[PDB]
């Protein structure tokens, strides 16, 4: 799973590692705290993957809605779709009907996701045609 697997060199923008200062010959890595009580995963701080869409080692911020759901597909590259089950109330019959929504969310390499897992996603800016959410917490299922 080599980092440099593209036509262009993968780098974090404007994080300059000087090849001349002195030793500690490893590239400096930037990361942030997303806030709202979410911890930065260890793979984000000591990792080596480059992901501009990562909430922790990337330029996207988390703001707006916080959602949770069950992962139903991990067949895209760095993107998952999660299922949100809920119950719709029909007043005339004083009852409920089962409904669901599929939401596409970016998954950072800092996490590990498999189908059948519950994840918490935070809302970011549009980062794809269908993606507006980004994984912040993975619960094994």
């Amino acid at each position: 799973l080599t980092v440099q697997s593209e036509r262009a060199f993968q780098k974090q923008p404007h994080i300059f590692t000087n090849p001349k200062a002195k030793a500690n010959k490893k590239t400096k890595r930037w990361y942030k705290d997303v806030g709202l009580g979410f911890k930065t995963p260890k793979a984000a701080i000591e990792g080596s993957y480059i992901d501009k869409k990562c909430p922790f080692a990337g330029t996207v911020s988390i703001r707006g809605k916080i959602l949770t759901g069950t992962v139903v597909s991990t067949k895209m590259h760095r993107t998952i779709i999660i299922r949100r089950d809920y119950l719709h109330y029909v007043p005339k019959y004083n009852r409920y009907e089962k409904r669901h929504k599929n939401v596409a969310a970016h998954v950072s390499p800092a996490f590990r996701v498999e189908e059948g897992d519950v994840v918490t996603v935070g809302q970011c800016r549009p980062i794809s045609k269908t993606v507006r959410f980004n994984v912040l917490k993975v619960s094994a299922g």
């Binding site: 036509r7 060199f9 000087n18 090849p19 001349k20 596409a104 045609k129």
Partner: protein, 203 residues
């Protein structure tokens, strides 16, 4: 004209959408600049808000940065050697962001020779070694000798960058957006980024 609306696309379910309105001016697009290397030719575009962009049609020179030395010079673009998006851009010498170019190494050579009092290239050429030896010992005062002596130690550069200076052409990557800002600026490739692009170039 060119439109950036998303309503003309299919749904995420694959459904065909129906037209909801006519095309709006606030969702337009324009033609690409397709900047080439040549005598300067910059056109102005009036944009939203009465603002103004500059479309570089042709540019000769650019502002390029030596990151590990903290100095930037206005040098000459020699050509395009690599483009991650499309090799046709290399073939036609189209300057966009992220294109890998060769620039003239002359101004950087003057700066380094004046600053550290040494030479770059390691080419003991017939007439090259004459220049190298002359640069080694020139007409130079004493306080300046001492400041250069203190500046040594931080005077050797990495071998991969050094070996290029014997050609006068340094590898670089464009960082500006020539079709938008009208300028073609960049930085000298060094380190593992330089190693990666050299590996790609040798193919």
């Amino acid at each position: 004209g060119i439109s950036r609306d998303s309503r003309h696309k299919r749904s995420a379910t694959g459904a065909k959408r129906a037209q909801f309105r006519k095309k709006r001016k606030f969702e337009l697009g324009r033609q690409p600049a397709n900047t080439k290397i040549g005598p300067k030719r910059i056109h102005s575009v009036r944009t939203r808000g009465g603002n103004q962009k500059f479309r570089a049609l042709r540019v000769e020179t650019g502002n390029f940065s030596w990151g590990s030395e903290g100095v930037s010079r206005k040098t000459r673009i020699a050509g395009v050697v690599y483009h991650p998006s499309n090799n046709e851009l290399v073939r036609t010498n189209t300057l966009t962001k992220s294109a890998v170019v060769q620039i003239d190494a002359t101004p950087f050579r003057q700066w380094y020779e004046n600053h550290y009092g040494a030479t770059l290239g390691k080419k003991k050429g017939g007439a090259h070694a004459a220049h190298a030896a002359e640069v080694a010992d020139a007409k130079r005062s004493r306080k300046v000798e001492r400041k250069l002596a203190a500046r040594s130690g931080a005077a050797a550069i990495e071998s991969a960058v050094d070996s290029q200076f014997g050609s006068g052409r340094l590898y670089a990557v464009i960082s500006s957006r020539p079709g938008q800002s009208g300028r073609c600026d960049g930085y000298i490739l060094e380190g593992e980024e330089l190693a990666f692009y050299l590996r790609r170039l040798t193919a």
